[PDB]
């Protein structure tokens, strides 16, 4: 019988190439615009992933939109963290197979602090030695971990799917090779990591919001990403969104 984890492995999108043009000198504006073009295409792939994620399309369409609009940066930063862990052990930001940013290439204006925060996310995978199946279950949980304070249109469906994936993360921990001796400690550590992602991504989001609204910086955004940010930004800045935390703050 096929398992839900086996399905998460099969539906995970292939890694995209950027098409970065190395012939021009790096500038913060050009690099950020290139990263946003790659990000918009990664978000398209993440939407197709969510459509294929078992249970997700049973949500009301407005809730599917809300969850993707609220969680997109968490999903992208978590996956960047994973690729940087697998490909460089957290030493370089592995945005794409043709766009790998090492510590020297990140000393451009504005870039350094944001890039260090993205490396911090990847360092958590190193510290915890996260398995691929644990990563896949946690990534689903990030899609399901930011909601309106006023609730969702299909709340009972949402509560059921979120509980299903919480159980799946448990299964991924139990199926790591070793014994059951450390399974509660592991679940505690990975849910502490999930809770920490809200803060770790929050600064990335504030930076993205500033580069989006301040047109004088000349950072380009592709169309679907601009639409998503335009909807997400006012809700986040007004304090109308809440993270679903596993632990007391």
């Amino acid at each position: 019988f096929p398992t839900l984890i086996s399905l998460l492995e099969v539906i995970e999108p292939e890694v995209l190439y950027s098409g970065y043009d190395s012939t021009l000198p790096d500038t913060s504006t050009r690099l950020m615009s290139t990263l946003n073009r790659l990000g918009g295409r990664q978000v398209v792939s993440a939407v197709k992933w969510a459509k294929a994620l078992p249970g997700f399309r049973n949500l009301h369409l407005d809730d599917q939109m809300t969850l993707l609009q609220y969680s997109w940066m968490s999903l992208m930063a978590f996956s960047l963290g994973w690729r940087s862990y697998k490909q460089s052990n957290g030493n370089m930001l592995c945005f794409a197979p043709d766009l790998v940013i090492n510590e020297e290439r990140m000393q451009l204006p504005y870039m350094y602090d944001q890039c260090q925060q993205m490396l911090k996310i990847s360092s958590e995978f190193v510290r915890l030695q996260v398995s691929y199946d644990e990563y896949l279950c946690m990534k689903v949980l990030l899609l399901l971990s930011t909601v309106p304070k006023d609730g969702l249109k299909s709340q009972a469906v949402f509560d059921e799917i979120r509980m299903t994936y919480i159980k799946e993360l448990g299964k991924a921990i139990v199926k790591r090779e070793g014994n059951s001796s450390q399974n509660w400690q592991r679940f505690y550590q990975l849910t502490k990591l999930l809770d920490s992602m809200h803060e770790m991504v929050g600064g990335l989001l504030q930076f993205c919001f500033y580069t989006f609204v301040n047109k004088s910086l000349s950072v380009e955004f592709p169309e679907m990403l601009a639409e998503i940010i335009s909807n997400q930004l006012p809700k986040f800045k007004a304090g109308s969104v809440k993270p679903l935390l596993f632990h007391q703050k």
Binding site: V44, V47, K48, K51, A52, L61, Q64, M65, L68, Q69, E223, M224, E227, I228, N231
Partner: peptide, 12 residues
Amino acid sequence: PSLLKKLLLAPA
């Protein structure tokens, strides 16, 4: 009418 809604509604 948003691009995200069109993609969510489109056949896979």
